[PDB]
From Swiss-Prot, chain A:
The gene is lacZ. This is Beta-galactosidase. The record marks 384 as: Important for ensuring that an appropriate proportion of lactose is converted to allolactose. Changing residue 179 to A: It forces the apoenzyme to adopt the closed rather than the open conformation. Reduces the binding affinity. Induction: By allolactose. The chain holds residues 617 to 1024 of 1024 of the full protein. It comes from Escherichia coli (strain K12). Homotetramer. Belongs to the glycosyl hydrolase 2 family.
Length: 408, 204
């Protein structure tokens, strides 16, 4: 949280107009005299340009900054401008090179109008009454026809999942979701209570449909489940998996949420990976944990960190570590692509949810991955009543998202 | 537009068409539309659409489809907001229900012709033998957008061959705080980038 503060409370303010940056000083008494502005342009994580400019703004003043002609490539992707204010010299409370402020903008987008290279190969579908198998190369994917989930996958002789890939609509309650609700004295208004009461945490799936079809150049799986509790259908998930000659699966998901059920904490999938890698690399917001109503301090870019850093050791364990606006995530040989929020650690939601202290958590078999098409905000106006603003509640009813899972 | 792809595939119990276009202007791709039509034994087509809007292009007024129908019917019946013209930043007075009115009533004779007659939150619309189902906003009259756009007065409009139908997955707000500067609030601007929608067209 500390960063979100730091950024919001920063003393310099920016506005971008064309290729001119307007800087506003919120200092009342001092002049920007230990301040440098670093600027920089990059295309999907790739740096194309940098500058540095000394700030000469008086308290309550403005400074105009015109940027050099900015490169612009043919390549697809998003072009982002990022600026940082630096304190070149040390003060009594800061080191040299301390960053006092920052801001970023999206400059342009070159949309990708390029269709992939027609698959050399073609996947084979092997049916059975238990499942559908897809093979292509060393790669194989299995979908269980009884459950409707992708139960396993192999690269070579190695299995990748410990747990099937499945829909997730809940979260290990944050302090704010709980509020002052106790086992003794239940607060029926607390998000958790609502969710609890409505069956979110204990709803059971229901295969409505599960089919395989052979396309000209790919296999197409199609499923549908209903989550229900006491004969009430809470949600409905409709997917399509489409594996192609490239050995890429494209998941497309479409949820329907009942108008009359408390809005879900989230909407995405999760699964337990078999692997355990040392780093995580992604192209999205970061580097730090960021939620929807708490992500202004985060920057879009390519981040690479140790797994350990993707977990936030809140003494009272709960959902944590999320990173939003992710476009690509890489872990081991996996790579997922799209627009989603995600989190990844060695602790299942359930373990988090069931441990009173962080010191009692134990790392699980592999890596737990939660990939969200959507996530509700965290709130915080107070911690004893619902504080999540409406804009951050998953109240649309219809939700759509897509992924591309693949390997390297 | 630009055909990027167009394929037919045969499914166990249906046909599946798949397309992709790019709209561009001066080598800039503004939008990208990706659909799938899926016709089944029921003789129902399900359209599924997915638009990508360039971050750096003014947000579009809308996002949907249109076409000119050959038929011309006397009534329009729908299940959604109405009965009156309603836009996104202007629909609190409207009620969700089943409305049935004369075609004539689906056009708003603003003396200075412009986009009009929209009805939001529609779940089902019926015109002649057609029935469309989903979640969309729509409008329907005898005037193309172009005709509206090119006529200074309403008295000069002429009804066109059949019925023009505009079905929107999304529509930007109308504004009004004032009429001499942009007045559409941000919440009503189509600024997401990624837009998804689906329809079911069929007959009775």
């Amino acid at each position: 949280a500390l960063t979100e503060a730091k950024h919001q409370q920063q003393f310099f303010q920016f506005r971008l107009s064309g290729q001119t940056i307007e800087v506003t000083s919120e200092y009342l008494f001092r002049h920007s005299d230990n301040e440098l502005l670093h600027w920089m342009v990059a295309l999907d994580g790739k740096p194309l340009a940098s500058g540095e400019v000394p700030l000469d703004v008086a308290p309550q003043g403005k400074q105009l900054i015109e940027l050099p002609e900015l490169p612009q490539p043919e390549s697809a992707g998003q072009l982002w401008l990022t600026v940082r204010v630096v304190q070149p010299n040390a003060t009594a409370w800061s080191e040299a090179g301390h960053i006092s402020a920052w801001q970023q903008w999206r400059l342009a987008e070159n949309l990708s109008v390029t269709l992939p290279a027609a698959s050399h190969a073609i996947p084979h579908l092997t049916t059975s009454e238990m499942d559908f198998c897809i093979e292509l190369g060393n790669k194989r994917w299995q979908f269980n026809r009884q459950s409707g989930f992708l139960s396993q996958m192999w690269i070579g002789d190695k299995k990748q999942l410990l747990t099937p890939l499945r829909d997730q609509f809940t979260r290990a309650p944050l302090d704010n979701d709980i509020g002052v609700s106790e086992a003794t004295r239940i607060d029926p208004n607390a998000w958790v209570e609502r969710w609890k009461a409505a069956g979110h945490y204990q709803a059971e799936a229901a295969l409505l449909q599960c089919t395989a079809d052979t396309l000209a150049d790919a296999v197409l799986i199609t499923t549908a489940h209903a989550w229900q509790h006491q004969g009430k259908t809470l949600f409905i998930s409709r997917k399509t998996y489409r594996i192609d000659g490239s050995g890429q699966m494209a998941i497309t998901v479409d949820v329907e949420v009942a108008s009359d059920t408390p809005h879900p904490a989230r909407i995405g999938l999760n699964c337990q990976l078999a692997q355990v890698a040392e780093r995580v690399n992604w192209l999205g917001l970061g580097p730090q944990e960021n939620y929807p109503d708490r992500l202004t301090a985060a920057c879009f870019d390519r981040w690479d960190l140790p797994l350990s850093d993707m977990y936030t050791p809140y003494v009272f364990p709960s959902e944590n570590g999320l990173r939003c606006g992710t476009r690509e995530l890489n872990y081991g040989p996996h790579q997922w692509r799209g627009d989603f929020q995600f989190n990844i650690s060695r602790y299942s939601q359930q373990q988090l949810m069931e441990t009173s202290h962080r010191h009692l958590l134990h790392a699980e078999e592999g890596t737990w991955l939660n990939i969200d098409g959507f996530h509700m905000g965290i709130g915080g106006d107070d911690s004893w009543s619902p504080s999540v603003s409406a804009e951050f509640q998953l109240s649309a009813g219809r939700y759509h998202y897509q992924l591309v899972w693949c390997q390297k």
